[PDB]
């Protein structure tokens, strides 16, 4: 299949291990599994692509452990020790331990694990000094493993073979440049207490770009949630072009919803297009992760019902040039409402209804002379575009017409 499809088959299989009483935790931890495996690009899928049977049972035992979790995020320290054990639960470790010690900054085990790999690779060889040959074998081995990422070339000196030591400032700047989520956390703890706030700000600005990748968002969540004065950070971000917007959409698509709630409540600016895109992004994410429906919906209603954003919500429902800026948002909300692939309480469906209806009432009151077209446009977005979780060969436009009837 496609690489994306292989990622989800591994994501969905690793999601079976997640078991918790609260439905919100299970579903937030499922998003972390997709982040760990990779959604739009490969993350740890590179190492677990061929894992089958007992190899997958090892990862099943790791992610089902409460100690490897911290709320809905992965405990990197716990993972680092587990992924460097010889065997847990009687099951051998199928991962490459040196690569895991590098990725999770298990600095006590990096060098002894690399020497094991170096010795077994040297012994497979037949004019060059034995010292120079070892330097050659070390370079050939490190260059091979470096194909999977620059982290695997980070800790081992190529001239002496000794474990490299780094200043926290240098390792922090390198982990951001490497888009290395686990590395950003390790060096932050070793940073000076006065350098912490200044360093986090630099990282947020650098990765809050339009060219961002999903790997940037974990770093952004960690850095934002540890910034003390989010106010002063929001001022510097606004000076950067689309810095606020880029930080927002990155955490939304990666399901860092608690990080955005705290961000939107502080300074209860961004452009009108930014406003409309936040809603479009959330609504899409809602469909890509339907078990997080409530959380995403709640974030939409905060962007919508923010009194300071009154000028933005009115233009959002302003019908102009045979389109309304939020036709998709409405359409995607309706699709969620009619979701029969996942069990939902009838109460949930109902709150989901009055959720939409209150938004349509705002559009009816704001522009009543354009409200007739608004209706045609909404059903247009529901019959012309196919979305995830939307069933085939059923008219979702009839459902919108049902809501319009109740509205009047």
């Amino acid at each position: 299949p496609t690489q994306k499809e292989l990622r989800d088959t591994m994501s969905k299989k690793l999601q079976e291990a997640i078991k918790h009483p609260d439905p919100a935790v299970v579903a937030g931890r499922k998003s972390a599994i997709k982040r760990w495996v990779g959604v739009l690009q490969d993350n740890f899928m590179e190492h677990i692509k061929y894992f089958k049977g007992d190899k997958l049972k090892f990862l099943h035992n790791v992610f089902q452990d409460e100690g490897c979790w911290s709320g809905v995020r992965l405990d990197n320290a716990a993972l680092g020790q587990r992924f460097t054990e010889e065997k847990i639960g009687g099951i051998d470790n199928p991962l490459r331990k040196y690569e895991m010690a590098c990725s999770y900054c298990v600095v006590d085990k990096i060098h002894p694990l690399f020497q094991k790999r170096f010795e077994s690779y040297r012994n497979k060889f037949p004019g060059k000094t034995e010292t120079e040959f070892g330097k050659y074998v070390r370079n050939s081995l490190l260059d091979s493993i470096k194909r999977k990422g620059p982290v695997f070339d980070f800790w081992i000196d190529r001239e002496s073979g000794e474990l490299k030591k780094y200043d926290a400032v240098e390792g922090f700047d390198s982990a951001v440049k490497f888009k290395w989520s686990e590395g950003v956390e390790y060096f932050y703890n070793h940073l000076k207490e006065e350098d912490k706030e200044k360093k986090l700000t630099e990282a947020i600005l650098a990765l809050s770009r339009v060219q961002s990748v999903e790997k940037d968002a974990p770093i952004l969540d960690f850095c934002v949630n540890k910034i003390v004065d989010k106010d002063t950070l929001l001022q510097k971000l606004s000076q950067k072009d689309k810095g606020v917007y880029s930080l927002f959409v990155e955490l939304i698509e990666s399901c860092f919803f608690d990080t955005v709630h705290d961000l939107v409540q502080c300074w209860c600016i961004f452009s009108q297009r930014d406003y409309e895109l936040f809603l479009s992004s959330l609504s899409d994410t809602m469909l890509k992760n339907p078990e997080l429906s409530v959380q995403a919906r709640s974030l939409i209603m905060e962007f919508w019902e923010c009194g300071s954003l009154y000028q933005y919500r009115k233009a959002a429902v302003n019908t102009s040039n045979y389109t309304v800026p939020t036709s998709g948002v409405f359409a995607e909300l309706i699709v969620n409402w009619r979701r029969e692939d996942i069990y939902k309480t009838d109460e949930e469906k109902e709150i989901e209804k009055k959720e939409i209806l209150d938004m349509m009432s705002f559009a009816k009151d704001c522009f009543p002379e354009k409200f007739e077209l608004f209706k045609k446009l909404i059903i247009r977005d529901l019959r012309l575009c196919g979305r995830e979780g939307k069933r085939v060969n059923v008219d979702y436009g009839l459902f919108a017409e049902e809501l319009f009837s109740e509205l009047e």
Binding site: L277, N321, T323, R383, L384
Partner: protein, 741 residues
């Protein structure tokens, strides 16, 4: 620019010629399909039917059209999906009616406007101007045609006498007369000469009818501004909420006119022509680039909209499916996008890490399109590693096959007439990738093993089979066979030369066969057993031939680091690069059999791919086109001949924040079969470089610098030593080509 429809409506033919010339540079694969069904006619129809909505034309400038379908062939009496497009423009208060005929064929029967078409036209003109005087109307008939692909002409027919200014019959009329009579092989003189019955004339009058296009409820003036952005979420919303709903509406609005008087219309090519036309209406205002892939089993189109030289704008990939579910069409669009760096030039004109994918089926009543976002990054496929991994893991064979097939040049058609070209490219690519791989094998059990490569020379000198052996020291051995459809020998390869401690060492075989349908089949890997049991059981089954060890090629990787970077304008660094490549291939010249320019190019292509540097290497890369004009004689004939310019190999770095100069390196490759053929091959290569130096706008979006390096390379098959295997210029300065911005 000034606008294609604008220059056409105003009668500015030279302004239309220069404008259409710029669109042909934007869509380098447009001409390959102008003779495929109604691709070209629907293209121009789209441009006209959407011009009012784009504010290109005013409501005063009325546009009337008609699809003049060809019908049955006079030679074999079979249905044709081709047609001509008759379009006329009338502005109220003006006496000029500009009439246009668009067709693939330069002088197709019925291409001229007919008398009945003139009556059907003036009928539509008066639906708004009832008492209009037709005698005061002056008709200006024009022709626009392109065929082959190599020629594009715009003609203003001379003024003609009354009743001679219009032809007797259009293409559709000629088809109806033949159907009304019995013979389908009636010539024009026959048809024109026969007197027609009054009932037959009524059917002719009911057949010819014109329709009018007008502005819609949705203006599309700024539709390309919405796509010239770097925000994937914005571009996604604009396509899903405004752009595609409009295209779906307009195509479905004129849906009945498309299917009328036509049988077995090519929906793939007509749907793609409609999309290209929509884009062509903005060609004069924006730097658009369209990469069309309409080869058999391909229905993709990828484009990128920019104002000037933005490097982070979001590409869009659309897959058109005539009879497929919308999700299926999106899957195909996502699959194209993941491999967009191999296939397309779009990842060269933008450095965006994401692409907006769109799957479109115009025929569906519900869910005609679906849009999603896919990551865009260049992948490094480890051929030798995946070969070892595919022995215990299923599905890697698909990726291995896709790796070899997708890197085939799109110029070479995958038919029976180019079987040897396809086989030469696949084997040469596979050789360069595997022979020039410096990395060891990453074993499954937390270990690494160095790989010594071998290549086998079959006893039959003229056998189309590439056989290589990869020995992972301390681990298993993999024998790779890439055989032609008839090279199915199953004799065992002697591995006695391989120094193998017995261990748990197994010998594996992976056999690949290119069939007559041009599909590469990779059989299930077979364990041939332990090394010692393999040698004893095949004691009298060893294939006649020699197993030649591949030399170490690690210095080529280090040399390419200097050549691709600081030494890209250094002729001596390039000279040393090919001297080392020559030093590696010389012990293998007989076993490899570089018997064609395709094999030579693919060996180098696989060599530059496997090496970390260059970041990107492309084969048979189209840099652009050249347009030579001819003017003739009122009768105003403008003829444009198009000649393509391609680079055999283009080596590019990746744009980085500190250095945006991709250091483009281009190689013109030729093969000399004999030492006497050498001088002619070198001169031919030097002549092609001189023509490549006439191209500029093709090299400008590929780099931020202002120079390109071009070198002529000749493979000397009869070279005595390695110093003369690959012939490189000795320098007795013509490789650095400054770009005009």
């Amino acid at each position: 620019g000034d606008g294609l429809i604008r220059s056409l409506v105003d009668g500015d033919l030279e302004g239309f010629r220069q404008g259409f010339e710029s669109f042909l540079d934007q869509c380098p694969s447009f001409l390959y399909h102008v003779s495929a069904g109604r691709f070209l006619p629907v293209f121009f129809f789209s441009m006209f039917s959407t011009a009012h909505d784009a504010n290109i034309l005013n409501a005063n400038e009325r546009v009337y059209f008609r699809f003049d379908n060809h019908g049955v062939n006079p030679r074999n009496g079979e249905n044709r999906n081709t047609a001509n497009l008759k379009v006329a423009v009338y502005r109220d208060g003006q006496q000029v009616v500009r009439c246009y005929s668009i067709s693939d064929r330069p002088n197709s029967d019925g291409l001229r406007f007919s008398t009945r078409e003139r009556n059907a036209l003036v009928q539509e003109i008066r639906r708004q101007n009832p008492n209009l005087r037709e005698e005061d109307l002056n008709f200006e008939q024009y022709k626009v045609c392109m065929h082959g692909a190599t020629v594009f002409e715009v003609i203003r027919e001379k003024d003609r006498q009354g009743r001679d200014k219009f032809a007797k019959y259009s293409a559709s009329e000629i088809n109806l007369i033949r159907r009304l009579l019995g013979d389908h092989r009636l010539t024009i003189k026959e048809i024109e000469g026969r007197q027609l019955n009054q009932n037959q004339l009524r059917q002719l009058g009911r057949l010819v009818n014109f329709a009018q296009v007008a502005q819609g409820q949705q203006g599309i003036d700024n539709f390309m501004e919405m796509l010239a952005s770097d925000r994937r979420q914005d571009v996604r919303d604009r396509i899903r909420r405004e752009i595609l709903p409009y295209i779906t509406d307009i195509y479905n609005n004129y849906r009945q006119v498309l299917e009328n008087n036509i049988e077995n219309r090519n929906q793939r090519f007509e749907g793609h022509g409609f999309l290209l036309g929509f884009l062509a209406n903005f060609s004069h205002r924006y730097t658009i680039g369209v990469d069309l892939d309409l080869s058999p089993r391909n229905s993709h189109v990828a484009f990128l909209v920019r104002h000037q030289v933005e490097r982070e704008n979001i590409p869009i990939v659309i897959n058109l499916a005539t009879r497929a579910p919308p999700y299926i069409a999106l899957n195909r669009a996502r699959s194209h996008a993941e491999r967009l760096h191999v296939f397309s030039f779009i990842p060269i004109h933008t450095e965006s890490r994401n692409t907006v994918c769109v799957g479109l089926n115009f025929n569906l009543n519900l869910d005609p399109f679906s849009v999603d976002t896919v990551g865009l990054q260049q992948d490094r496929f480890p051929l030798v590693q995946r070969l070892f991994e595919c022995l215990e893991n299923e599905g890697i064979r698909e990726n291995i096959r896709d790796f070899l097939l997708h890197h085939l040049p799109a110029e070479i058609p995958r038919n029976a007439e180019n079987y040897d070209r396809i086989f030469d490219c696949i084997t040469g690519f596979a050789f360069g990738n595997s022979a020039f791989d410096r990395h060891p094998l990453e074993l499954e059990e937390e270990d690494e093993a160095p790989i010594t490569k071998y290549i086998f020379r079959h006893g039959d000198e003229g056998l189309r089979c590439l056989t290589m052996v990869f020995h992972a020291e301390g681990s298993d051995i993999v024998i790779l066979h890439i055989r032609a459809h008839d090279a199915q020998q199953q004799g065992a390869i002697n591995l006695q030369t391989l120094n193998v401690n017995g261990n748990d060492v197994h010998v594996w075989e992976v056999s690949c066969t290119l069939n007559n349908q041009l599909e590469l089949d990779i059989d299930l890997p077979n364990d041939l057993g332990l090394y010692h049991d393999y040698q004893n059981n095949n004691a009298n089954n060893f294939l006649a031939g020699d197993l030649v060890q591949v030399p170490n090629t690690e210095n080529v990787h280090n040399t390419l680091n200097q050549v691709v970077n600081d030494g890209w304008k250094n002729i001596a660094q390039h000279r040393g690069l090919f001297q080392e490549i020559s030093g590696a291939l010389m012990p293998l010249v007989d076993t490899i059999n570089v018997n064609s320019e395709d094999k030579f190019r693919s060996i180098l292509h696989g060599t530059f791919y496997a090496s970390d540097n260059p970041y990107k290497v492309l084969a048979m890369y189209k840099v652009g086109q050249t347009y030579s004009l001819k003017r003739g004689q009122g009768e105003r004939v403008i003829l444009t001949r198009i000649t393509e310019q391609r680079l055999d190999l283009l080596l590019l770095r990746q744009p980085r924040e500190n250095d945006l100069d991709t250091h483009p390196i281009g190689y013109v490759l030729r093969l000399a079969n004999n030492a006497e053929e050498v001088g002619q091959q070198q001169n031919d290569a030097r002549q092609e470089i001189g023509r490549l130096k006439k191209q500029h706008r093709g090299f400008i979006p590929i780099t931020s610098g202002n120079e390109v390096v071009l070198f002529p390379i000749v493979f000397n098959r009869d070279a005595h030593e390695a110093g003369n295997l690959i012939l490189f210029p000795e320098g007795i300065e013509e490789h650095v080509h400054r770009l005009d911005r």
